[PDB]
Chains A and B, each alone.
With several copies, the nearest count.
Chain A
Amino acid sequence: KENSKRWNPEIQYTSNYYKSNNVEFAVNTEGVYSEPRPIGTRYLTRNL
């Protein structure tokens, strides 16, 4: 767990509120699941 006392808000991985034909990380009209972008594991911060 992150015990950090950092005051300002962290960066988080968010799915942008968007308007599009298809839903990211979900099936399209032909039933083909698709992953839109590579997802990193590094968002929260820690001191060096």
Chain B
Amino acid sequence: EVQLVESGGGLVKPGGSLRLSCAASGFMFSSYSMNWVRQAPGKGLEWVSSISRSDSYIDYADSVKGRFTISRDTAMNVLYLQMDSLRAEDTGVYYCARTHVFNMFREVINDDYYGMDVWGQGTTVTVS
């Protein structure tokens, strides 16, 4: 039983700032990549940002680059997405997923991508 629960979604006027947290349980939280995806109202899933296993590589979708900061505390497993300078397009439902790798001991430096493994039910962020 592996569970990831999103939190902190709410209603914030445009230009404001919201911090979203993802509380991980049941698995080792520091051994996996973790990343945030976003579903706008009446639209398909969209990807936001990512953070690597050792936190070396932080990635951002082109649209939110520079307005968001992803980071994990790691003292107590949790994930954090700092949303700054929100727009009207940032309304949606934010999910917390973890890319799944069967073996964490790499045998080769370029590994074929396997996609996200565990997801949260997601929280709703609304701007007015």
Contact = CB atoms under 8 A, between A and B. Distances in A.
Contacts of B108: 37-38
Interface string B48-79: 00000110000000000000000000000000
Contacts, number: 32
Majority SS of interface residues in chain B?
loop
Contact of A19 (B54, B103, B107): B54
B28 interface: yes
A contacts with B: majority SS = loop
B104 A17 contact: yes
A12 to B, nearest CB: 10
Given A18-B31, A20-B30, A39 B107 contact: yes
Interface string B102-114: 1111011000000
B25 to A, nearest CB: 14
Interface in B90-119: 102-105, 107-108
Nearest to B101: A16
Interface centre among A11, A16, A17, A18 (most CB of B within 10 A): A18
Contacts of B104: 16-18
A16 B105 contact: yes
A18 to B, nearest CB: 4
Nearest to A43: B105
Nearest to A21: B30
Interface of A: 11, 14, 16-21, 37-40
